[PDB]
Design a protein around this ligand. Structure first.
Ligand SMILES: CCCCCCCCO[C@@H]1O[C@H](CO)[C@@H](O)[C@H](O)[C@H]1O
Ligand SMILES: CCCCCCCCO[C@@H]1O[C@H](CO)[C@@H](O)[C@H](O)[C@H]1O
Ligand SMILES: CCCCCCCCO[C@@H]1O[C@H](CO)[C@@H](O)[C@H](O)[C@H]1O
Ligand SMILES: CCCCCCCCO[C@@H]1O[C@H](CO)[C@@H](O)[C@H](O)[C@H]1O
Ligand SMILES: CCCCCCCCO[C@@H]1O[C@H](CO)[C@@H](O)[C@H](O)[C@H]1O
Ligand SMILES: CCCCCCCCO[C@@H]1O[C@H](CO)[C@@H](O)[C@H](O)[C@H]1O
Ligand SMILES: CCCCCCCCO[C@@H]1O[C@H](CO)[C@@H](O)[C@H](O)[C@H]1O
Ligand SMILES: CCCCCCCCO[C@@H]1O[C@H](CO)[C@@H](O)[C@H](O)[C@H]1O
Ligand SMILES: [Mg+2]
Ligand SMILES: [Mg+2]
Lengths: 254, 254, 254, 254
């Protein structure tokens, strides 16, 4: 049932945000030690768990970009597209609120101790606990290219890993492998844009952060062109390119 | 036989404590380098091994909260509940004593060198080698919420990973995946409460620490409200919520 | 079709370079924290993904040394050898350009801040983002021995992991295991030569770096004997020794 | 054939030493960054590869303690025991020489720079590249207890992971899981004795180090009672206890 699938997409997208935003909060306001690979693998494995938990019900999209791509290249029912996307964004938003609720005291004490005014340009760093912001050395277009390229890779390898006509079928290994994939994408490109590669994963938490006191910078990142647009559209375009590329360069040869 | 199952629960719960408490002792009194993810994955993988070693005999609960939940939602024989719980707590207690026995000299030399009086408020840090204590910035209720939420997630994903009616059956991958799950829970929430999520894993070692010289603070954590109550009840409530939620939101849709 | 296989070899070799060179760029010009094991496992897992993505089409060589060895000991069609090698080198070259394009600004800002003249001997460090260079304490012959030994091990274990007549068949685990293998080779020997073990992985990116401003040192490493020859021939010789050794010492006993 | 099996045991034991001693050399004389978990997982995964490479031929003992235990509790042919042990020790010795050969220059330059006299008490640290030595805070008996306990755990879980009558058969996952097991044992207890848990893994390299200039301290560790005896006998006793315990406490209940 569609209602059941939306609930699963809501929970699954929320789960991956819980683990992902959770470890970044630990890093930023709890003083926990994590390198780039550690934060990346925790997020990737968290996604794997979200898939194992929802694959049997909704097919585990947990990403607006994947939903749209599966509709354009995998015959996914277009009538379930928007319900899926709303469920995903809502799930991400709620999980972000939940993580903030559990780490509540650490955020304030950290802001007090380091004299950080929530909502100021300098608070964009802590807002980074919930969503992504560009590296100081790159611009809007540069960041857009990164998100596009990585989501194309994301979609392409997801189809490859779940394509039973490509080499030996992965079976129950698929979700795990998809998580490991997300881990290497995050570790190799994360310093540039935080590798959002998922509109719901970024927008939902940004809306929460906006409501929780970070204000307008939660959306703009303090840049001339509102940054939120990159994590919102870059992945959608990328996922489409990736799906197309797989069927044309790899599928058409299997 | 019940006697055989209790022995398995005793050994399995003891195994996961050996590895878990072992690496924390290495971190605290042996100067070994470990980040938050490293200590968490070692504990998670250790749990996986404990499951592979006991699944075929007792079903590998190794956690009072899981035993109680499987009794309320999985038709587990209520006559085996208490025997299982006593075996689990006893196993955790003995493994803690074993780890202390092997690291014995390092504890004393560390306390001597850093002028730490065992049993004082400041010794709660080393007592943390055996069990969990709250982050300095959060209170009793806050810590209770964390343990509840994470154990609900723990139970929910355990049912999902072992549910052959949900997506492609995991088979022998299940225990490993459950260990990886524990790893991401510990890495994303560990800075808050040490992610006990298991009454036997926390209480047994606390009793040992109490007997080994840490005294009353082993139980209270040096807080107004004795902390041990959180790791004791928070997980039980959480496991129940998690089991219920899985069958209602995911099971009823498979 | 050969055309389809060349495309797959081009994409697969390009993928492993994207992830590999990507994380090193993060380390060198983005200030990301990675230990030796982290950079090594990211590269190994990246290779695994490249295999899952191309195994069903070309058999996933993604390495000139492996192609040549499979031709000499696995009956691989010699008519596909050169097309495969050209595809591999081209793929590696393009992925290197792509990574440089995404990290563009960080390279220049880093060179400006640290007063590094691209093309000078001291820029060999940053050129190391794309390919391999010898440890300061070893010479040409010493580096040649390392690459030979590790590629022999690489080839030998690849045959062992994909040999269904050796123990229980790995099935879909094979690519993952091959990635983990590459990870341990890189972590245990990487400080010596960067463990190239693949002519295309090293030469293609070196040509790009040469074109991108690093000049002649990209090829020589600033050494009397042009270093590029080691990563070029050491692996080919090694792969052959490894293949031979497997069939004679392990295969002939199965 | 026995000759073929001895060759496999020689290569497999040599492989695990190559990776293991290799990464420690990187840590000690090449300045590579590795935490306790990283060095431990590299060694564990290296063992897994050694098993995948030799399981089909010899059954992959790669450890004198395991060979002796399988003879006493698994009906292993006693006529193959000594040939297996000699092959294992020889393999470990040769791999140690090989790693020293590749890192040759770094050892000398490090000793020159830090003014270390090879063979002196203070050189025991570098000798630790090849084999194990006790933590400064524990004595002979204490170290003996550690090796005994961990090898008992090692043997017990190896039987459990390879016992098709215990839960769902692991199949091709077994070797990997055994490697992960070795990883958690090394990470949780490594700071105490270096977790040798294998007579060949320790003695062979100690003999090499003795011959390579470290002299008598390679065997004694600079202690009153020659340390080499612990890694030599502690594991044998432990493996026997572990095998017995598994069949009595877990097997007899399956
Ligand atoms: C799941 C529903 C979550 C609703 C949003 C709750 C946000 C609570 O967040 C609060 O927001 C206030 C207003 O910005 C700030 O002043 C407070 O500092 C902040 O704690
Ligand atoms: C599915 C997602 C739809 C998003 C629609 C655009 C929402 C943009 O959100 C807007 O961002 C501005 C940034 O300057 C703020 O000033 C506004 O307050 C905010 O509403
Ligand atoms: C497995 C059974 C374990 C029984 C408990 C052994 C505890 C030994 O621990 C000892 O306890 C003493 C009293 O608190 C302290 O004074 C010592 O410092 C401590 O080493
Ligand atoms: C299954 C677990 C049952 C636990 C029952 C409660 C045991 C509490 O333990 C008590 O904690 C107090 C904390 O101030 C101490 O003062 C007491 O000495 C100690 O016995
Ligand atoms: C995929 C095709 C890539 C072609 C090579 C593009 C290299 C762009 O690189 C440019 O090269 C110039 C000349 O060396 C340098 O002066 C510039 O600093 C550098 O950015
Ligand atoms: C398949 C790979 C074929 C490589 C053929 C050799 C290419 C060597 O390349 C050469 O290296 C020299 C190093 O000093 C440079 O001076 C030259 O400019 C460069 O063309
Ligand atoms: C595989 C066969 C290996 C045989 C042992 C080779 C040891 C080479 O090692 C050498 O040993 C000399 C004598 O101790 C030392 O003086 C040298 O410094 C050392 O490099
Ligand atoms: C299978 C392994 C058999 C080992 C037999 C004992 C070998 C001990 O080796 C001995 O150790 C002494 C330590 O002080 C040294 O003085 C001797 O030179 C050395 O031969
Ligand atoms: Mg690490
Ligand atoms: Mg790791």
């Amino acid at each position: 049932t569609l209602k059941g699938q939306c609930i699963a997409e809501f929970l699954g997208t929320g789960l991956l945000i819980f683990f992902g935003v959770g470890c970044v909060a630990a890093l930023k306001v709890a003083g926990a030690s994590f390198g780039q690979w550690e934060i990346s693998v925790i997020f990737g494995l968290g996604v794997a768990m979200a898939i194992y938990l929802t694959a049997g019900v909704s097919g585990a999209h947990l990403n607006p970009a994947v939903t749209i791509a599966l509709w354009l290249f995998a015959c996914f029912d277009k009538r379930k597209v928007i319900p899926f996307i709303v469920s995903q964004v809502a799930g991400a938003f709620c999980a972000a609120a939940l993580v903030y609720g559990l780490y509540y005291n650490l955020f304030f004490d950290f802001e007090q101790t380091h004299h950080i005014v929530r909502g100021s340009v300098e608070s964009v760093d802590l807002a980074g606990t919930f969503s992504t912001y560009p590296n100081p050395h790159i611009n809007f277009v540069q960041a857009f290219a990164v998100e596009m390229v990585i989501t194309a890779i994301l979609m392409g390898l997801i189809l490859a890993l779940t394509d039973d006509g490509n080499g030996v079928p992965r079976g129950p290994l698929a979700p795990l492998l998809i998580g490991l994939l997300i881990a290497v994408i995050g570790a190799s490109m994360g310093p540039l844009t935080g590798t959002a590669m998922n509109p719901a994963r970024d927008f939902g938490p940004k809306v929460f952060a906006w409501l929780a006191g970070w204000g307008n910078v939660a959306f703009t990142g303090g840049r001339d062109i509102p940054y939120f647009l990159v994590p919102l559209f870059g992945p959608i375009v990328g996922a489409i390119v990736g799906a197309f590329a797989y069927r044309k360069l790899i599928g058409r040869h299997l």
